[PDB]
Design a protein around this ligand. Structure first.
Ligand SMILES: CCCCCCCCCCCCCCCC(=O)O
Ligand SMILES: CCCCCCCCCCCCCCCC(=O)O
Length: 111
């Protein structure tokens, strides 16, 4: 139930995205999860819908979230909306590109 379990859900979703929901998008996301030994970098592209480790040469958006914060969402226990207000996720670059994504996250549980 670590960062691996959190991303495991994304990598599966990104490669499972349906043309009925979203649409041909473009850009990149830089997810940063806090840790006891530092922070884990991640690159989430929207052009081809994929995910990678580390940091991109220059992401269009930079997301900053803590471990507990992520586990809360991916754990289906909490919603991005709540954490959003609390200030769990930081916005760097284009709050739109990031906010738009959360839209797909804020939904019914069990997923
Ligand atoms: C940096 C934010 C944390 C990780 C983001 C989880 C990504 C979930 C799946 C991405 C695709 C969902 C949006 C559909 C349109 C698209 O982006 O192609
Ligand atoms: C600023 C808006 C961006 C919203 C990003 C939500 C915080 C990071 C991603 C949350 C956990 C995502 C892991 C599972 C995939 C999903 O269901 O979204």
């Amino acid at each position: 139930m670590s960062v691996e379990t959190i991303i495991e859900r994304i990598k599966a979703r990104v490669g499972a995205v349906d043309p009925n929901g979203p649409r041909k998008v473009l850009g990149v996301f830089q997810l940063n999860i806090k840790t006891a030994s530092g922070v884990e970098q991640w690159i989430v592209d929207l052009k081809q819908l994929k995910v990678d480790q580390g940091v991109f040469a220059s992401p269009d958006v930079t997301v900053t979230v803590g471990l507990e914060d992520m586990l809360a969402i991916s754990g289906k226990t909490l919603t991005v909306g709540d954490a959003l207000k609390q200030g769990k996720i930081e916005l760097s670059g284009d709050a739109d590109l990031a906010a738009k994504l959360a839209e797909v996250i804020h939904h019914h549980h069990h997923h």
